[PDB]
């Protein structure tokens, strides 16, 4: 079975350089061209260039001639793409894909490598309780604001409250992340019983427990 495995997500600072790998298995690596593609939010897909492992021949999209460099090692069946002088415009997901001549296309694709070029520093979040404005059900929540980088984890009552929990996707606001999580429980269980959100932000080794009390 043909497979292309790429290196993991990269976090680089402006001006740095990164080398993304693409390991092939399931076929004769030296016989097929490897294509490199760039996927940047709001910019569709861009072709970077290609390399034929068996000959080492390379062809670049003019635009990337001074940004990318292709290499390959037939002994380890791995292709590599190095990006230099990184800038925020280089932030994107990069893919390698196999081109088959008689197919006239790219059939198998790597899983992609997410590259983030940033100079931002780790920032802990501020955690705030979300109570109703003082039905059979009641919705409580917790706001996790101003943290970087992602992610943060949120549990309710130390994992005891699991059903009815909605941890929403994070969004940016002033260069930082904001997330919220909510739990819907029986109106007869709160405030009659306690509801506490447990927030953790590994990157900053911060842990905050916030009890949701009536307003």
């Amino acid at each position: 079975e043909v497979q292309l495995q790429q290196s993991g997500a990269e976090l680089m600072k402006p001006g740095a350089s990164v080398k993304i790998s693409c390991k092939a298995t399931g076929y004769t690596f030296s016989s097929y061209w490897i294509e490199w593609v760039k996927q940047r939010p709001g910019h569709g897909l861009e072709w970077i260039g290609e390399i034929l492992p068996g000959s080492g021949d390379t062809i670049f999209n003019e635009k990337f001639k001074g940004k990318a460099t292709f290499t390959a090692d037939t002994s380890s069946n791995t292709a590599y793409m190095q990006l230099s002088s990184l800038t925020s415009e280089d932030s994107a997901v990069y893919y390698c894909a196999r081109w088959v001549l008689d197919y006239y296309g790219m059939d198998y694709w790597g899983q992609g490598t997410s590259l983030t070029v940033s100079s931002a520093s780790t920032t802990p979040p501020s955690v705030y309780p979300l109570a109703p404005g003082g039905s059979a059900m009641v919705t409580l929540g917790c706001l996790v604001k101003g943290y970087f980088p992602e992610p943060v984890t949120v549990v309710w009552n130390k994992g005891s409250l699991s059903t009815g929990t909605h941890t929403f996707p994070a969004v940016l606001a002033a260069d930082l992340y904001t997330l919220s999580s909510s739990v819907t429980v029986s109106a007869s269980s709160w405030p009659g019983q306690s509801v506490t959100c447990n927030v953790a932000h590994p990157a900053s080794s911060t842990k905050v427990d916030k009890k949701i009390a009536p307003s």
Binding site: Y104, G105, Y128, T139, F168, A170, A173, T178
Partner: protein, 212 residues
């Protein structure tokens, strides 16, 4: 530097036939452009579907086929399946260059449509003490996963300090999203009624609250 154009979005249902197209700004698409079609599923998972205009990739379901329709390349999915929901990109070979289209987001209705459930939370006393005020509007159980959010303070639209998340899939396969309106504590006190309005397929669901 040819420009390749695709439909931005299309919706279909299980069992139906849907056709996606790929146009070139340079002229009519022909077999000499060796049109490719690839599929991107959640978590940026790409799979090649078509190459050389009509060659199906290894392991790709027979329901996918490529062709030329008029002066454009086309991808036909006959008997659409829920799993076919994805973003489809076409690529054309022109001027010894490989140019990709902007991609078409194909939605396949795999469950009943559902209007959103909206909940609006006021700023916590704790946050207000920092001279900050964030209202949180949670949006859950909606399908399909496309909504637009509008905030109004005392009847007037407000977008300054507002941010809305992308929709994400819930355990029950419906979607959820959140919207936030942030102001200074002082500004929060200069208004009375706050409203979060969520529009989904032409219908608007609203929730409001009074600072006092």
């Amino acid at each position: 530097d040819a420009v390749v154009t695709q439909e931005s979005a299309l919706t279909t249902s299980p069992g139906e036939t849907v056709t996606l197209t790929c146009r070139s700004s340079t002229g009519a698409v022909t077999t000499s452009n060796y049109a490719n079609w690839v599929q991107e599923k959640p978590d940026h998972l790409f799979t090649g579907l078509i190459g050389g205009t009509n060659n199906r990739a290894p392991g790709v379901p027979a329901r996918f086929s490529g062709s030329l329709i008029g002066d454009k390349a086309a991808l036909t999915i006959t008997g659409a399946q829920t799993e076919d929901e994805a973003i489809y990109f076409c690529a054309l070979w022109s001027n010894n260059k490989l140019v990709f289209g902007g991609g078409t987001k194909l939605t396949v209705l795999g469950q009943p449509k559902s209007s959103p459930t909206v909940t609006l939370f006021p700023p916590s006393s704790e946050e207000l003490s920092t001279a900050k005020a964030t209202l949180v509007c949670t949006i859950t159980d909606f399908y399909p996963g496309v909504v637009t959010v509008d905030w109004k303070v005392d009847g007037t639209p407000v977008t300054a300090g507002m941010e809305t998340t992308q929709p994400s899939k819930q355990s029950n396969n419906k979607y959820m999203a959140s919207s936030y309106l942030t102001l200074t504590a002082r500004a929060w006190e200069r208004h009375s009624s706050y409203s979060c309005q969520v529009t989904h397929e032409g219908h608007s669901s609203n929730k409001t609250l009074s600072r006092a």
